[PDB]
Nucleic acid binder design. Structure first.
Lengths: 53, 119, 109, 44
RNA sequence: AGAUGAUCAGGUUGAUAGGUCUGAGGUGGAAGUGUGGCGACACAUGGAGCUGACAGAUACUAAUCGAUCGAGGACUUAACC
RNA sequence: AACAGUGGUAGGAGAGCGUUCUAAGGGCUGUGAAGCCAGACCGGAAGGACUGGUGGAGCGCUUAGAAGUGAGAAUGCCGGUAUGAGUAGCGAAAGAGGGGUGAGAAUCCCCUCCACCGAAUGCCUAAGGUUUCCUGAGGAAGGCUCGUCCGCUCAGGGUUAG
RNA sequence: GACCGAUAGUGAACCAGUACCGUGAGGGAAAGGUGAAAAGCACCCCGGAAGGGGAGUGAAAGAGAUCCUGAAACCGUGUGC
RNA sequence: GUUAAGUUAGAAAGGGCGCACGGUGGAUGCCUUGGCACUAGGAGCCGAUGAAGGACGGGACGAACACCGAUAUGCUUCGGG
């Protein structure tokens, strides 16, 4: 229940390949321009689907 | 199916019940999205009861909702508000009494919050 | 070109590494959008230092903020802080409150 | 659980205390040892 | 369908999910009213009322607007040409 | 020159390399010492130079001498940093919403509901602790996260007996 | 002084028999270096701050408060094969 | 051109070797404010006229050090400067 050997740098990195972050699904705010998540609200425009809250 | 929300039956009922009352009062609230998804059904359901307006429905909805104020200067409660105001609002609509606009996540949870409305 | 540094900030470096491995080699505006929209602890720090970098460029070099690119961006493990968690049976476990030096370099096209 | 050290300043000062150490020869020798080392707190 | 990825059905000329209305099935005869009874209670209103996931409709709500990736197709020889 | 020989543990013998210091003599060094990093140089070995870079003041060479004189291993000592691995864990117990503050809020304050204790998780009070109390500022550390918050940090104040 | 030169040398070159441990006797550490001189960074920007980039001082700021040099382990960035 | 058959490049999610640049870390070199062992000389006891050792207090200014003792961060009175 313990490592029989110490893990090398190479395998450490090979494991940490997939350990990463994809970017968001991004879109502009057509109202005031800046970027935004898809299907979500522009925090700065305060707008969504051509409608302000 | 239906969700559990990391709670027991009793305390999720209490959650949803409080939230229904809070939404009836404020006509808009910010929560998590999943909680909103689970509200949407029961909330439109109580609105059906309001559209009925019968006393049987009054007593059902009273069994569900909580005894809070919804409008000072009127001594009004959530239940009276529900039936009178909201049924007078939605005589004509057949379901879909809500909107769920997704917001981004939260700082502490990373939890996707979202607002919910009465449309 | 231009530079900005955040030296000795209490955060683990690997996490910062992730967040800037996202944006290494991108336009500044979209990078700021990334950091604003991604839900991680390090994005505010990184957009802060980046914003400082572009400010340094515009103020001390006048390099047309919109026309900028992250030339390079990296993290360096800084001085840790040592702590101890009292685990069971009178034994303690060493805890490494890490620290990072964030560095960003900005140039033109 | 109950543990060994149950503090009572009276018991501490009446056992490990200055009057007590000065009462006995061997307690004086402590103070001698406990000075030429240089301990600030030479007794309770 | 599924630990997550994935897979599948759908993404506004659309029924993907919710809701609404019909139903199925389940529970068992609601609340209120009236009658009888001192009363507990019973009878009628009335196979009632209620109902989570079930299936059939329904464009009411949400699947928006976007964005990204993705080919230009090596050489030699043999046959047709 | 010729001839012959030159595997080697324990172990014996002999040749040397290198480090610190000292004596003497001869030197280098702000026009850049030692030390450190590179380099495709030299020597049979230990090893030794040269060039460049860093550094910014002490150091080699020769002959001798004297030694705390050479480290790869002691479940060695000390320190530092890794692996495991962004894994386990985040320490019993109902919270939700609206307002507010603030650079910044699941986590701080207020309100409303809901929920738990109730021979106890409530009131008094010992021993013990020794300023933790109150107020106002702060959020580097500690808080198993955050933090605008405190039993944390600063200031101040506060404990009245026939 | 053919004695040590900060893991050495007193345990202790620094507020040490301190902190800390222990009921107690008793045990018992770690931790030196800005610069010749504070001349210790006016002022401008980023930022809530911290921390940076400029400017300036200085022979030197890659000297900036763990402040001479600053190796290795370890951590990363880029790239020739 | 097509068809058939056969050859061979190139790839990089990421990784290895080398190189360059940095970080962390505190070795190494230089230095000494401290210590180690000795030599020569001196002196080898202090206390009820209250010891050694401490506690508590004293500064215009907080704590600590050091100094001092309600005459408290010095007071006479002889000298030096």
């Amino acid at each position: 229940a313990v490592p029989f050997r110490r893990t090398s740098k190479m395998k450490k990195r090979l494991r940490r390949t997939h350990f990463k972050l994809n970017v968001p699904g991004m879109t502009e705010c057509p109202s005031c321009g800046e970027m935004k998540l898809s299907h979500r609200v522009c925090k700065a425009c305060g707008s969504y689907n051509g409608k302000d809250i | 199916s239906y969700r559990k929300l990391g709670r027991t039956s009793a305390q999720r009922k209490a959650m949803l019940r409080d939230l229904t009352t809070d939404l009836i009062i404020n006509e808009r609230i910010e929560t998590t999205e999943t909680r909103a998804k689970e509200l949407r059904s029961v909330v439109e359901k109580m609105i059906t009861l309001g559209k009925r307006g019968d006393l049987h429905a009054r007593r059902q909805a009273a069994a569900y909702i909580r005894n809070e104020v919804a409008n000072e200067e009127n001594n009004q409660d959530a239940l009276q508000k529900l039936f009178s105001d909201i049924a007078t609002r939605y005589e004509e609509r057949q379901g879909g009494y809500t909107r769920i606009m997704k917001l981004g996540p939260r700082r502490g949870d990373g939890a996707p919050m979202a607002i919910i409305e009465l449309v | 070109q231009a530079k900005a540094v955040a030296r000795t900030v209490r955060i683990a470096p690997r996490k910062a590494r992730l967040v800037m491995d996202l944006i290494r080699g991108k336009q500044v505006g979209e990078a700021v959008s990334i950091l604003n929209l991604t839900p991680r602890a390090a994005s505010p720090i990184i957009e802060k230092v980046l914003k400082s970098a572009i400010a340094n460029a515009e103020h001390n070099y006048e390099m047309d903020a919109n026309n900028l690119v992250i030339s390079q961006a990296f993290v360096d493990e800084g001085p840790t802080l040592k702590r101890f968690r009292p685990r069971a049976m009178g034994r303690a476990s060493q805890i490494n409150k890490r620290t990072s030096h964030i560095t960003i370099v900005v140039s033109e096209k | 659980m109950k543990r060994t050290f149950q503090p009572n300043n009276r018991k501490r000062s009446k056992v490990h205390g200055f009057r007590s150490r000065m009462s006995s020869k061997n307690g004086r020798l402590v103070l001698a040892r406990r000075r030429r080392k240089g301990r600030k707190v030479l007794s309770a």
